[PDB]
Amino acid sequence: VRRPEEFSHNEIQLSTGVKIHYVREGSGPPLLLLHGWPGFWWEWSKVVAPLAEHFDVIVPDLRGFGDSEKPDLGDISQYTLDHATDDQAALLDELGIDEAYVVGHDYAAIIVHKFIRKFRNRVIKAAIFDPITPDFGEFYFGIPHVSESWYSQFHQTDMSVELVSSSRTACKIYFTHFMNHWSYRDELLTDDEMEIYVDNFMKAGNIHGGFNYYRANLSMTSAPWNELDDEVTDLPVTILWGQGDTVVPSLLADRLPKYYSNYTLEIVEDAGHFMMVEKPDIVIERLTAAFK
Amino acid sequence: PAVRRPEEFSHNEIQLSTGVKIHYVREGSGPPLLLLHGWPGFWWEWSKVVAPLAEHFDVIVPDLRGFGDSEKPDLGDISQYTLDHATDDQAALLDELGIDEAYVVGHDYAAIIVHKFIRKFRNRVIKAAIFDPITPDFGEFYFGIPHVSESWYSQFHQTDMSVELVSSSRTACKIYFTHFMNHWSYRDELLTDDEMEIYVDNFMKAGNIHGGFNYYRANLSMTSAPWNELDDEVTDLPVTILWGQGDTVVPSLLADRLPKYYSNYTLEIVEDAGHFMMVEKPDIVIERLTAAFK
Ligand SMILES: [Mg+2]
């Protein structure tokens, strides 16, 4: 287990008005790895050094997460996924990168979906794990998947922030459920690993900032998708799907042709929602091979 | 120390033909009147209306199985937490008290219990009243869009983590339940802090958190069917319906569904009341029940 401090840390101010934290190492074509919720850059820790043999690996914290800036926590409008998508192109800008390989899942599955249609000329190839497409809502908020999406509505309440942040123990109890339930195997993280997550989420504004994503993009009056996002894209895309993902299940894969005309699909039977945590060997091999 | 303390009632615990030990308080002289709580709650949610009602009724206020000081059936066996069981418990309690027929009042989970009781045990009801009723119709709306913004908690309770988090301390327990007491109420703050501490005292008892959540696992999981073909019966029992317009979880726009199941009822929408009519507007409860049950 390679700890957060055993990485090379950076912080820069982007044109989008927000300060973004990221780690970086390796040499080669740029490779941007984007986390979701629950998460922050460190969820990719198992795969950074191996990929750094072939890529300039760049792993930022999304705004509202990790050590990146939390916009005014009372301003839900700064937590749209469109903002976080613009943050990624502005990061490449600030680093003098013309185009990059892009990888995302969970919330970052939407960012990548948006990114390669709005910033097509900034992406070489892309990969998405357990992708989420504009037609996801009808299922996600439907019967019986409401059994799984309840947390998105929990996070609209002020009491959710108050309860989850009431102590380290309450924080660990809450987040431990999603890491395991959304995973193929019964226990995803070692206790020490989970403790590093609690360290992260007990940072000022991180519980609140993460829930604002749900208030900004998954409320009953939220409209996070754009007309642009309905475009079929012919970008070469690598799709991996964890058959164990209970919240974004692999059966939704029959919807990919609605939006992608040139993709590979691999359903991993013994993986769930966190491919880079549970099956890092696979993430490493397929990205190295797909990205030349 | 500003409301009738829970110690200041006449308590009794009784084993029933159904196999559970039921706890209840009782006082008053008159025709019998059974008052049934829901979630979050226990017998003491009716405490503001018991003594005023006890001047004309024989008030009987039990803890539902899984709640309060009533027995928790095996917590790993959700089959013992269906609303059919809790309805039978009410008849079993009348039996054990020598009561042939009673006035009956229910809301929330007890709104369902009453719906079933007045159809299966019509022989045992004089008249009934339901606050913010819940009909067999309910699921399509409760789990529909956008009400999933309000029913998330029913699915939260399916998880093991919900029990682990909410029982983690008095603080967590109080933060959690405070949300529902207030959010489901017309006014911003339903309970005084001292009243809330009594609620926390109750839910920090062994199995009261787990047991309450089991009602959601037995009756409101996606594989549940708590309703029966009988419950589709249209009943002509005279039913008093009071509806809090500020109720966010069982909203009063649902009143158009009542004729589907009731042919002899009164309806009054209370503008400045929410999900807990007997807590937020105790006077209306007292005045309406005493008027209807004469
Ligand atoms: Mg699992």
In a 10 Å sphere around its CB, with 0-12 CB exposed, 13-18 middle and 19+ buried, how is residue B264 labelled? exposed
- The conformation of residue A65, written as its DSSP 8-state character, comes to S
Provide the H-helix boundaries in A27-182. 45-51, 81-94, 107-118, 136-140, 146-154, 158-164, 168-181
Which residue has tokens 């969970």?
A106
The answer to whether B56 is a known catalytic residue is no
A157 vs B contacts (CB less than 8 Å): 179, 183
Per the rule left: phi > 0, alpha: psi between -120 and 50, beta: everything else, A17 is left
Closest by Cα among B91, B78, B131, B145 to B265:
B131
End-to-end, the C-alpha distance of chain B in Å comes to: 34
Structure resolution, Å: 2.3
Q: Show the 3-state SS of B165-209.
A: HHCCCHHHHHHHHHHHHHHCCCCCCCCCHHHHHHHHHHHCCCCHH
- Separation between Cα atoms, residue A14 and residue A173, nearest integer Å: 35
Residue B164, φ and ψ in degrees, nearest 5: -65, -40
Q: What is the CATH number of domain B7-292?
A: 3.40.50.1820
Residue A258, φ and ψ in degrees, nearest 5: -60, -30
- Separation between Cα atoms, residue A33 and residue A61, nearest integer Å: 10
- Separation between Cα atoms, residue A90 and residue B67, nearest integer Å: 55
DSSP assignment string, B274-285: -S-HHHH-HHHH
CB contact at 8 A, A169 and B171: no
Q: Å from B142 to nearest chain A CA? A: 11
Closest CB to A146: pick one of B148, B159, B176.
B148
- The conformation of residue A123, written as its DSSP 8-state character, comes to E
A94 in helix, strand or coil? helix
Could you give the count of Cα atoms lying within 13 Å of A63 in the half-sphere of its Cβ? 31
CB contact at 8 A, A269 and A276: no
In a 10 Å sphere around its CB, with 0-12 CB exposed, 13-18 middle and 19+ buried, how is residue A265 labelled? middle
State how beta strands A19-25 and A56-60 pair.
antiparallel
Angle A255-A256-A258 from CA coordinates, rounded to 5°: 75
CB contact at 8 A, B241 and B266: yes
Task: Give 3-state DSSP helix, strand, coil % of chain B, rounded to 5.
Answer: 45, 15, 40
Which entry of B89, B108, B132, B247 is annotated as an active-site residue? Answer: B108
Distance A184 CA to ligand 1 centre (A): 5
A62 in helix, strand or coil? coil
Whether residues A219 and B149 touch (CB distance < 8 A) is answered with yes
Q: What tokens appear for B75 in the block?
A: 């917590």
End-to-end, the C-alpha distance of chain A in Å comes to: 28
Distance B19 CA to ligand 1 centre (A): 36
Closest by Cα among A34, A39, A59 to A48:
A59
- Separation between Cα atoms, residue B102 and residue B84, nearest integer Å: 19
Rg over alpha carbons for chain B, rounded to the nearest Å, is 18
- Residues of B in CB contact (< 8 Å) with A are 143, 145-146, 148-156, 158-161, 164-165, 168-169, 171-172, 175-176, 178-179, 183, 221-222
How was this one solved? X-ray
Distance A47 CA to ligand 1 centre (A): 22
Q: What tokens appear for A116 in the block?
A: 């390669």
Per the rule left: phi > 0, alpha: psi between -120 and 50, beta: everything else, A64 is left
Closest CB to A143: pick one of B150, B160, B222.
B222
CB contact at 8 A, B193 and B201: no
Q: Which residues contact A287 (CB under 8 A, 6 or more apart)?
A: A31, A51, A101, A103, A127, A238
CA distances from A172 to A151, A159, A175, A196, B281 (A): 15, 17, 5, 10, 40
Residue A51 CA to chain centroid, in angstroms? 18
CATH class, range A4-290: alpha beta
State how beta strands A237-242 and A263-268 pair.
parallel
Angle A191-A194-A197 from CA coordinates, rounded to 5°: 155
Q: What tokens appear for B266 in the block?
A: 């009164």
Q: What tokens appear for B3 in the block?
A: 């409301």
A158 vs B contacts (CB less than 8 Å): 179
Angle B136-B141-B143 from CA coordinates, rounded to 5°: 100
Angle A183-A189-A190 from CA coordinates, rounded to 5°: 150
- Separation between Cα atoms, residue A49 and residue A84, nearest integer Å: 25
Q: Which residues contact B249 (CB under 8 A, 6 or more apart)?
A: B150, B151, B184, B275
Residue A21, φ and ψ in degrees, nearest 5: -95, 145
Per-residue exposure over B53-90, b if at least 16 CB sit within 10 Å of its own CB, e if not: bbebbbbbbbbbbbbbbbbbbebeebebbbbbbbbbbb
The residues that bridge with A266 in the sheet, in sequence order, are A240
CA dihedral of B276, B279, B284, B286, whole degrees rounded to 10: 120
CB contact at 8 A, A116 and A259: no
Could you give the count of Cα atoms lying within 13 Å of A87 in the half-sphere of its Cβ? 30
- Separation between Cα atoms, residue B134 and residue B36, nearest integer Å: 14
- Separation between Cα atoms, residue A56 and residue A291, nearest integer Å: 12
CB contact at 8 A, B221 and B78: no
Element (H, E) at B219: helix B208-219
Closest CB to B172: pick one of A148, A154, A163.
A163
* Angle, helix B109-120 to helix B208-219, in steps of 10 degrees: 60
CB contact at 8 A, A171 and A202: yes
The strand order across the sheet containing A123-129 reads: A9-13, A19-25, A56-60, A30-34, A100-105, A123-129, A237-242, A263-268
The strand order across the sheet containing B239-244 reads: B11-15, B21-27, B58-62, B32-36, B102-107, B125-131, B239-244, B265-270
Residue A289 CA to chain centroid, in angstroms? 22
Closest by Cα among B278, B241, B236 to B52:
B278
A233 in helix, strand or coil? strand
State how beta strands B239-244 and A56-60 pair.
unpaired
- Separation between Cα atoms, residue B77 and residue B71, nearest integer Å: 13
Q: Which residues contact A53 (CB under 8 A, 6 or more apart)?
A: A26, A28
- Separation between Cα atoms, residue B86 and residue B66, nearest integer Å: 9
- Separation between Cα atoms, residue A52 and residue A25, nearest integer Å: 6
* Angle, helix B193-203 to helix B170-183, in steps of 10 degrees: 120
> Testing the interface with B: which of A136, A145, A150, A172 to mutate, by most B Cβ within 10 A?
A150
A219 vs B contacts (CB less than 8 Å): 149
> Testing the interface with A: which of B142, B147, B157, B161 to mutate, by most A Cβ within 10 A?
B161
- Separation between Cα atoms, residue A123 and residue A5, nearest integer Å: 30
Rg over alpha carbons for chain A, rounded to the nearest Å, is 17
Could you give the count of Cα atoms lying within 13 Å of B225 in the half-sphere of its Cβ? 4
